[PDB]
Amino acid sequence: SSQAWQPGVAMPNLYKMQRMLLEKCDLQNYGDSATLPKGIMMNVAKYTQLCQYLNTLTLAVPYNMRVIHFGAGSDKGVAPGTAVLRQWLPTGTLLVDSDLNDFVSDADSTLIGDCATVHTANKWDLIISDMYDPKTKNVTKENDSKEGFFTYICGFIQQKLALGGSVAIKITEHSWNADLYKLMGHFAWWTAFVTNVNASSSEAFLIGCNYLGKPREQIDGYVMHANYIFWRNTNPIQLSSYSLFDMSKFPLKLRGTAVMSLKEGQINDMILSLLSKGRLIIRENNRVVISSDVLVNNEN
Amino acid sequence: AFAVDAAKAYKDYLASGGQPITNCVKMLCTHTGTGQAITVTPEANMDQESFGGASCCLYCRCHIDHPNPKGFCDLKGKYVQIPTTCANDPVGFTLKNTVCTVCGMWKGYGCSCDQ
Ligand SMILES: C[S@@+](CC[C@H](N)C(=O)[O-])C[C@H]1O[C@@H](n2cnc3c(N)ncnc32)[C@H](O)[C@@H]1O
Ligand SMILES: Cn1c(=O)c2c(ncn2C)n(C)c1=O
Ligand SMILES: [Cl-]
Ligand SMILES: [Zn+2]
Ligand SMILES: [Zn+2]
Backbone angles phi, psi at A210, to 5 degrees: 70, 90
| 3-class secondary structure, A245 | helix
Contact A181, A225 (CB under 8 A): yes
Long-range contacts formed by A23-26: CB under 8 A, 24+ apart:
A23/A226, A23/A229, A23/A230, A23/A233, A24/A139, A24/A143, A24/A173, A24/A229, A25/A173, A25/A202, A25/A229, A25/A232, A25/A233, A26/A233
Catalytic residues of A, by residue number, are 46, 130, 170, 203
Class of residue A213 by CB neighbours under 10 A (exposed 0-12, middle 13-18, buried 19+): middle
| 3-class secondary structure, A183 | helix
Q: How many CB atoms lie within 10 A of CB B92?
A: 21
**What secondary structure letter does DSSP report for A185?**
T
Angle at A128 between CA A126 and CA A130, to 5 degrees: 175
Class of residue A72 by CB neighbours under 10 A (exposed 0-12, middle 13-18, buried 19+): buried
Q: Tell me whether strands A161-171 and A124-129 are parallel, antiparallel or unpaired.
A: parallel
| 3-class secondary structure, A163 | strand
Contact B23, A76 (CB under 8 A): yes
Ligand with minimal distance to B53 CA = 4
Cα A118 → chain centroid: 17
Q: Does B49 touch chain A (CB under 8 A)?
A: yes
**Closest listed residue to residue A64, CA positions, set A130, A123, A127:** A123
**What secondary structure letter does DSSP report for A5?**
G
Q: How far is A44 from chain B (nearest CA, A)?
A: 7
Cα(A205) to centroid(ligand 2), Å: 18
**What secondary structure letter does DSSP report for A215?**
-
Ligand 1 binding residues, C-beta < 6 A: A 43, 71-74, 79-81, 99-101, 114-115, 130-133, 148-149
Contact A226, A14 (CB under 8 A): no
**Closest listed residue to residue A168, CA positions, set A58, A76, A50:** A50
Q: How far is B115 from chain A (nearest CA, A)?
A: 33
B56 is in an annotated binding site: no
B48-52: strand order across its sheet: B38-39, B79-83, B48-52
Q: What's the rounded Cα separation, in Å, for the pair A287 and A292?
A: 17
Beta bridge partners of A8: A195
* Method of elucidation: X-ray
Ligand with minimal distance to A47 CA = 1
Any idea where the domains of chain B sit in the sequence? 1-115
Class of residue A294 by CB neighbours under 10 A (exposed 0-12, middle 13-18, buried 19+): exposed
What is the identity of the amino acid at A52?
A: Q
Contacting residues of B for A84, CB less than 8 Å apart: 27
Chain A interface, Cβ < 8 Å to B: 37, 39-41, 44-45, 48, 76-80, 82-84, 86-87, 91, 102, 104-108, 244, 247-248, 250-251
B29 is in an annotated binding site: no
Contacting residues of A for B28, CB less than 8 Å apart: 37, 40, 44-45, 48, 244, 247, 250
Question: In this complex, do A78 and B40 lie within 8 Å of one another by their Cβ atoms?
Answer: no
Q: What's the rounded Cα separation, in Å, for the pair A94 and A184?
A: 25
Q: How many CB atoms lie within 10 A of CB A16?
A: 17
Angle at B40 between CA B86 and CA B54, to 5 degrees: 55
Contact A50, A168 (CB under 8 A): yes
State the DSSP H helix or E strand holding residue A226, giving kind and residue range, or none if neither.
helix A221-234
Q: What's the rounded Cα separation, in Å, for the pair A280 and A59?
A: 10
Report how far apart the first and last C-alpha atoms of chain A are (Å, whole number).
64
Contact A4, A237 (CB under 8 A): no
Contact B89, B20 (CB under 8 A): yes
Resolution in A: 1.8
Which residues make Cβ contacts (< 8 Å) with residue A220, sequence separation at least 6?
A178, A181, A182
Which residues make Cβ contacts (< 8 Å) with residue A209, sequence separation at least 6?
A57, A58, A59, A166, A187, A188, A189, A190, A191, A278
Nearest to B23 among A76, A86, A244 (CB): A76
